[PDB]
Amino acid sequence: KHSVTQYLEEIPQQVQNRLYTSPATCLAIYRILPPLAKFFIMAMVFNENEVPLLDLDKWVNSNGKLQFQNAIKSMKSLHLLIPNKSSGTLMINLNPTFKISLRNALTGGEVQNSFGVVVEENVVSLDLLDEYSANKWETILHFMVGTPLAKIPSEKVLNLLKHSKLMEEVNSTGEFKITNEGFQFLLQEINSQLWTLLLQYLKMIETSKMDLVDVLHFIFMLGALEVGKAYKIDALSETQRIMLQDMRDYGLVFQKHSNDSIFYPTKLALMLTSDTKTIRGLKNQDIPDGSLIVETNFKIYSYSNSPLQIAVLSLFVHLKARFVNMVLGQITRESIRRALTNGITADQIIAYLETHAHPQMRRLAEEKLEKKLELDPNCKEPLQVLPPTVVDQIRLWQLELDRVITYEGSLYSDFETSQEYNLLSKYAQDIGVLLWKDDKKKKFFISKEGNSQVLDFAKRK
Template identity: 50%
Template sequence: MSSSNLFKATVNEHLEGLPETMQSRLYEAPATCLSIYRLLPPIAKFYIMSMVFSERPVALRDLDKWCKPGTRKVQFESLKRLKSLHLILEDRQGQYITLHPIFRKNFRDCLTGSQAPNAFGNLCLTPAEVSVSISFLDSFALSKWETILHFMVGTESTPTPSTSVLSLLKSGGLMEGSGSGLRITNTGFQFLLQDVNAQIWTILLQYLNLTQDLNMDPVDVLNFIFILGSLELGKSYTVSSLSTTQVNMLADLKDYGLIYQRASNSGRFYPTRLATTLTSESSALKSPARAMDQALESATSQQPSADQSDDAATTSISGPASAAQGSIILETNFKIYAYTNSPLEIAILNLFVHLKTRFANMVCGQITRESIRKALYNGITAQQIIKFLETHAHPQMKILAREKLDKKIEFDTNNNINTAGGAPQSQIDANGTVAQHRLEILPPTVVDQIKLWQLELDRIQTFEGYLFKDFASQQEYDVLSNYASEIGVLVWSDKTKKKFYITEQGKSQVVDFANRKLKRE
């Protein structure tokens, strides 16, 4: 069984798969340009910012001078992303690149504030009859989203989501069956362990795949989704400035908890935190269970101070009760304790933990080989399990992990000072921590064992790619294989037989480098 992540249909890959003409239409919306820029890797953002105010073409060979040595892999991935999105255009000789003219103009307008007044929605200037607070929007969004998750895991007495939500769950392969016989699939098990932003994008991308069946313009749909990611939380926006397609989307987006509208014929709508964080690097929801959040909040706010009482009414979805707080404690003997009474939280833990005891506000269990193998057979990967446990780890585990890391760094620093007069600069990263150490929230023995259990099932891995052989000299082999390794596309190499194997995506880059290198020599 392959342990590859089935959720590769990210928004970036969806955008890359669109035709060039459709991508150009997307770049006509300033909000879309800004959102796409946010989703790019750091070096790709650097390239765009370096070219956005200059219309002169840039030589490809000069790009290497813009970055530090040894970053060819990151440069290759960034250029590949920009080319697939057609954000950069090459000349016929493939020596110079320029920024997409439509994207440059609209993105530059966003940076200088010269975009059209309604580029990011029209605010309602008249006050609403009933005020809507941020805390209400958070509660509404969380209720809608948890209803979907509770329905997927089969929580008793959970209301059935709307017809549009059920159709997306079925068409996306998250659930199968019909009527009351709907049941979660292997893909659905993976979906439950995803970050909330990834879950929302999974639903939205499936919604985009159905736009043609719904007679909706996919560019109009994508633009509205990106506009939602740029709106301000707690503000109301007019419906009159939306297109017919976007107005029809409001009912569906309300079912997902992305917007709030008092009535279907209301002239205003409110984006929720699930919508305003669509293109953000921060997650809207770190805890999948509101019940757990309420239990933690009540435990930490039994005696609030004067300052705390003022903030209690505005606790957001990503506030201290949910984002900063965790509930799971994992011991080196594989025992796990979760301080929660949420059926959803318990159901998710039951996917990969053998639960033994349940109390009023806590469940106890143990991670076993059988429980992990059951999760792996359901399509869940070891990395997803580890990520879930780290995200929901108890605050005390994070404090202990930080103290342990500080002691290691202090010990190594003192040794370097005593032996070499100071820590080498190459061992210290941008945050001031020693590079060979990292924050280990979970016990390393447990993390390694979970990965080993997955390797038991992944004895054979297949890679699609190309084999390079029959080199004229050892030097020619060394140059090309080293370059393939630097850009991160090398899968296998044999120096004695002068053969190496690269990924399918890296072929064009290695061939272009070989042609330039051989012609020069």
């Protein structure tokens, strides 16, 4: 988890304070925080007198009071609060801007931005655009995955992917295929897919029109609700418009055509901070949408399917014979080499497959599990929960296929004594260069380019 929070906190306070104007964000980020934060924030939310510290520690009893640190670190980490060690104590209060940025929002303040959604005549249909972006939102996966349909045609979007370079494919030939990031691309479907990308916008977002609130606000304003109009008409900065253009271009925004309106709030924006139900021509029903068979017979077992996720699942198994709702494809010791041909371990595969395609394998989780949870100490010999038999073989083949590690560069060789190692190689294991730390080796390893602190101290020894 990249934990967008981590991206968030990267910036200094003035920028943080810059952003806290848009109230919904303050609320949005409020959701982000661990509960203690959420808790104590309220505790300070409506008392306009900075407060000591031990009191808060005196709020918590024993075990769990570590989260206090995990709490207080976080808030301090982004410095929402302002410490005051005036009287030796810590007099504390939020960034009042942010605090009022909340309170105003919390009790109907002057939030024109967070309340930028100017509702209008609702022309939105449920199936209306339900995949209308979902197509573009799905096709991009294929276009990213590399498939029959040019679902990844966004020149900016592609240039984003190329700029993002998270995909392991031949950009020289144009490919940005399943790298580990591509594998990760397969990994975090919605929360991962959205966020994992969204930063790419920021990743590309460095050149012109910083306007981060007008950027971020365009996000959480989207993250707010399907207000449709009242902003896309006017209530958005030009940075919003480009973001609006980008959002629709990213698909993540439910903006219709004609380039003059308030775009609808596509479901994605809900999914952006949902962590809830996420599924959604006219046939759109799950959970069986992802349909497949998991078992120790090394094959495709597919009645239902996601007509891309299949070829996605193929990315570790050879397609041999497509049929209407089934395909002959043998996922075997041979097939797994492909995920290693890309290189990524199919370890993500395990739980995901133990999580996905079970819609077609629901009788499986009882033909296999038998709920072998409480009978654990009554039998020395459990039964396939969760099915490891191929997974062991996988884990077997895992090393068995991998079975090597290579290094390259120069080779430092035949050192002198136990300082350069136990002065500056556990210190190379303390300044992050080494590509081998074998103490007695008297020889150590890096990657050729990586010496800026490697031909520097052993000379000094």
